[PDB]
Every structure is written in structure tokens, then in C-alpha cells.
Structure 1
Amino acid sequence: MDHYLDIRLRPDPEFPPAQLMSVLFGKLHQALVAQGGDRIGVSFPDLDESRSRLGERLRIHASADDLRALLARPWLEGLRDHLQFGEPAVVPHPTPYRQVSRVQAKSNPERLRRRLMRRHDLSEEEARKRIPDTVARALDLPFVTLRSQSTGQHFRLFIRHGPLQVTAEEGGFTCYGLSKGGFVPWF
């Protein structure tokens, strides 16, 4: 990433910090995956495990040409009213090694029993007995409240923060910003 863009969410009374950050992340998601690009990634510089929050600002690490069209895109723009956004600035030469990733799992035994019974064509009791109480697992890390078509109320967002390392392996990132198996510049 040759250009880092820092989006600082300005406090607003109309919306709360959690809802504001959730909306910003959701809007950015469509502004990056649909926009294209070889490597698209963001990190929460304000991430703190004490408050269990997702941070009050985000840093998008991308190339210069990628950010040139990303910031220019109307979808990624227009929210300057509630969020203070600057221009690209060269990141400092020293950078740490951190890889942010997402955990995909189901915490409901019913969904698992249904998925199992829908493959081998088992019975209701066969699917129920095959799913025990030990199959319900979920991340306990801080999860921002995101309300969308997935859940009516605030849905948790599972975000895993990679431990700080010395060696930083870069590379092409996912379309939605998921970990591609390499750390990202930490600065």
C-alpha cells in the first residue's frame, strides 16, 4: 500500500458511534469490492480491547492509483458531512506486522442440524441427535452492532486482530477486505 487514507468518524448526535461505524463500513464495502482493485484492506487504528469497541477511525491501505478512483467514486464519498476525511499521505517507513481476519461459524444448533439433514437426507431425530450442545461456538471479541437484512436487531461483527509481529508479508487482499494470509502495514 503506497497510499494510506485515514477516515475519522466525527461524533454525531443523530447517530451513535456503533451505528455510525457500522454504516461507514457497510458503505465502504460496496465502494471497494464493486470498484475493483488488486489489494484492498483497512485496519482500525483506534482498536482497543478495554472498551470492546471497533475504534473511532479507520485506515485504508491501498495503492495510489487505487485510492485515486476509490476516493473519487461517489459511493465511497458523500458522507463527508458526518465523517472528516483528508487526502492521501505517505505512510511512515517503519511498519508493524498485523493481519486482520474474519471468523465464519454458526452458533445455532438448529442451522447445523438442518444443513446436515439436507445433505444425507436424514430424519428430524437423526439430525437433532447428531448435533450436540458442544457444536455451538462463537467469537467473544469485540463485535460492532450491525443491523441489516441478516438480523433485525444489532448483529455482532466478528473481527479478529492479528498479533503484532516483526516480519510483514504483504500481498493481494480479499475483495471485502478479509485476511488473504498476510499482515498489513501497522503505523
Structure 2
Amino acid sequence: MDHYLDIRLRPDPEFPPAQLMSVLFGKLHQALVAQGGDRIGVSFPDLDESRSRLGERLRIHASADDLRALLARPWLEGLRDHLQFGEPAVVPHPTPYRQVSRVQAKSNPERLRRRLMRRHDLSEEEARKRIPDTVARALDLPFVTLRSQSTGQHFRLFIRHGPLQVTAEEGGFTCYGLSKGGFVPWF
């Protein structure tokens, strides 16, 4: 994956950039479940780790045929007025390589309590005795908010840009474009 395509959120008087970034990420995810495979990687070039902000840019990492297919496919319908685009081009080098991975946290003690009750046949009080409320961990990481279509929930999807490395390795990506082993050029 030596090719990239930058997408920057146009400023909108109607919307904040986080809402636009989340609906763009959901539509990219739906485009990848429509496409299939594990070869599509994402990034956030104007990231702010300190303020936990994604920035205002998103960058896809793939081959050029994937970029020209995704630049005209109807997952960009209704956002071309919200979005300005670049051109499908080759990445610069030398670049450090890092991973973009979805991090999940045990954020609700009661759901894991109900799982322990389902898998150990305990009552509610044994689940509260075995699992306290200190267990709940909150991440200090930026996030998109996503509407599931299988189930009906709205959940925060916390992303982590991994450590910078001098070389990249093989692997795939999930249907959200996040690394389950793959690496992306970071520039």
C-alpha cells in the first residue's frame, strides 16, 4: 500500500467537525463491508494526542484501484458538499510506520457482571462481590461515535495511533480500516 488519498472536512455552519468525521467513518466502514477484504487502512494526519482530537483530516491507505473505486462509489453520496478531496497519489518517503487500532475498555461493570452470571450461574450479589465498581476504566483517547446497524446501539469507538516504527509489517485490517496487524505510513 504505497498509495494514499487525503480527505479534509470542509467547514460547515451546520455541523461540528466531529459529527462529520463520525458519519464519514461510518460510511467508509459500510463501503468496506460492501467491498470486502482487509487491505484498506486509515489514518488521521492532523491528530492531537494531547487534547484527544482527531483533527480535521482523514487519509486512506490502499492501492490506487481501491482509491479510484472509492472516489466514485455511492458511499460518498451526500458528502461531496461536506468534503473536499485530493488526488490518488503515491505516498512520500522516508516515513515512520505506526498502527491504528481499536481499543476497547471494560467501561460498564454491570455488563461484565451479567456475563459472569451467564457463564458462572451466580446471582447479582455474587457478581457485585466478585466484580466491584473500581474495575470500570475510562480511556484518555480520541474517539468517533457510531450507530450500529446489526444491533441498535450508539457507541464510542476509541482509536489508538500506535508507536512510530522505522519499518512496516504485513497484516490485514478490519472493516473499519483499523489495524489488526497492518501498518500505515505516517506523514
TM bracket (short chain): 0.7 to 0.9
Compared with structure 1, are the counterparts of its residues 174 and 148 closer, same or farther at alpha carbon in structure 2 (3 Å cutoff)?
A: closer
SS in 1 for 2:174: coil
* Equivalent residues, number: 187
User: CA shift at 1:106, angstroms?
Assistant: 2.6
SS in 1 for 2:22: helix
User: CA shift at 1:153, angstroms?
Assistant: 11
Percent identity among equivalent residues? Answer: 100
Number of the residue aligned with 2:121: 121
| Greater alpha carbon shift after TM alignment, 6-15 vs 116-125 | 116-125
User: CA shift at 1:38, angstroms?
Assistant: 3.9
Q: Does the CA contact (< 8 Å) of 1:7 and 1:84 recur in 2?
A: yes
Unaligned runs of 5+ in 2: none
Q: Does the CA contact (< 8 Å) of 1:168 and 1:184 recur in 2?
A: yes
Please list the CA deviations of residues 143-166 of structure 1 after superposition, one character each: whole Å capped at 9, or x if unmatched: 345567899998533111111121
Distance in 1, matches of 2:150 and 2:38, equals: 28
TM-score by length of 2: 0.88
Q: Does the CA contact (< 8 Å) of 1:17 and 1:56 recur in 2?
A: yes
TM-score by length of 1: 0.88
Unaligned runs of 5+ in 1: none
User: CA shift at 1:101, angstroms?
Assistant: 0.6
Q: Does the CA contact (< 8 Å) of 1:45 and 1:55 recur in 2?
A: yes
Compared with structure 1, are the counterparts of its residues 186 and 104 closer, same or farther at alpha carbon in structure 2 (3 Å cutoff)?
A: same
Compared with structure 1, are the counterparts of its residues 31 and 179 closer, same or farther at alpha carbon in structure 2 (3 Å cutoff)?
A: same
Aligned-pair Cα RMSD in Å: 2.5
Please list the CA deviations of residues 30-80 of structure 1 after superposition, one character each: whole Å capped at 9, or x if unmatched: 012221244011000010123321110111000112222222211134411
Which contiguous aligned blocks of 4+ residues in structure 1 show a shift greater than 6 angstroms?
147-154
User: CA shift at 1:24, angstroms?
Assistant: 1.1
Q: Does the CA contact (< 8 Å) of 1:2 and 1:90 recur in 2?
A: yes
| Greater alpha carbon shift after TM alignment, 8-17 vs 165-174 | 165-174
